[PDB]
Amino acid sequence: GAMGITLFVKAGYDGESIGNCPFSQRLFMILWLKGVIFNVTTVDLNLAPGTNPPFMTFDGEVKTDVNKIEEFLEEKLVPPRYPKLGTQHPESNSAGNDVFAKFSAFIKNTKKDANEIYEKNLLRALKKLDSYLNSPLPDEIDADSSEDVTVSQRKFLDGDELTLADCNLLPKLHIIKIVAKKYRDFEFPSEMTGIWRYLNNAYARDEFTNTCPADREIEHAYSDAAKRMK
């Protein structure tokens, strides 16, 4: 029978390479971090007609919905052969969960008179995430620091290891960073040092950097943001 895992992802514009999709990147990262053998098939145009292309076969069985695939992988790939990637702190699963939605409304808005509201809503969401990244978690200890630790030095959302929460959020933050810069000259504010520490830590991980689609894929996917504000 069909055995193993195949992840089907959106193809880029060349019809063969990885295209823009935060959901595909999320699953790519999970499978990488699991240490499981898998292949990635790009989709270039028993599964329903026109199902949206981030899906997976597991021993031949088709699995849909990015959230359900995550839950299935975390439940089927377990120690000792595969690590658990679930978070230890429940707040890690909700931190910044509105950021991508607010960015989407900001970047898709056409009316200039509404930009201040959408941009401020984005900044408010980012502030909340930055606060979580900079506030030490309760169990956090800096064993090597004689001084008191007021700004968290942990690498990622939940601690020093990448978890499912990072696989969800990091692809979205990567899109925001590329698109908002290209089309709005908008950047994560310099005072949000938690977001910037987090991104610097993440871009130093092969599992994040080498699952990012090319910048031009992401910029092309959002090419409608180059239109004038009416």
Author numbering: 359 to 403, 412 to 596
From the paper:
CLIC proteins are a unique family of metamorphic proteins able to adopt both a globular soluble form as well as an integral membrane conformation. Additional to the canonical GST-Ω class carboxy-terminal CLIC domain, CLIC6 endows a unique amino-terminal, predicted to be highly flexible, which exhibits poor sequence similarity to any known protein. Hence, in order to gain molecular insights into the metamorphic nature of the canonical CLIC domain of mouse CLIC6, we purified and analyzed its conserved CLIC module (mCLIC6; residues 363–597). mCLIC6 was highly soluble in solution and crystallized using standard techniques. Similar to other CLIC structures, mCLIC6 can be subdivided into a TRX (residues 363–442) and an α helical (residues 456–592) domains, connected by an intervening linker region.
We report the crystal structure of the mouse CLIC6 canonical CLIC domain at 1.8 Å resolution, which reveals high homology to the canonical structures observed in other CLIC family members. The structure of mCLIC6 has been determined from two crystal forms at 1.8 Å (P 21) and 1.9 Å (C 1 2 1) resolution, respectively. The overall structure, in both crystal forms, shows two nearly identical mCLIC6 subunits forming the asymmetric unit, each with 55 × 46 × 26 Å3 approximate dimensions. Comparison of the relative chain conformations within the asymmetric unit yielded a root mean square deviation (r.m.s.d for all 226 Cα atoms) of 1.7 Å. However, overlaying the TRX or the α helical domains separately resulted in significantly superior alignments, with r.m.s.d of 0.6 Å and 0.5 Å, respectively, indicating an intrinsic inter-domain flexibility leading to structural plasticity. Examination of the structure using Adaptive Poisson-Boltzmann Solver (APBS) showed that while most of the surface electrostatic profile of mCLIC6 is negatively charged, the inter-domain cleft, formed mostly by the amino terminal half of helix α1 from the TRX domain, and helices α4 and α6 from the α helical domain side, demonstrates a positive surface potential. While this interface demonstrates highly hydrophobic surface properties, close inspection of its structure revealed a single inter-domain hydrogen bond, bridging the putative transmembrane region (PTM; helix α1), localized to the TRX domain (Q383), and the C-terminal end of helix α8 of the α domain (T577). Intriguingly, the structure reveals that R384 forms a salt bridge with E436 (2.87 ÅNH2-OE2), an additional cancer-associated position found in malignant melanoma, raising the possibility that disease-related perturbation of this interaction may contribute to an unresolved pathophysiological mechanism.
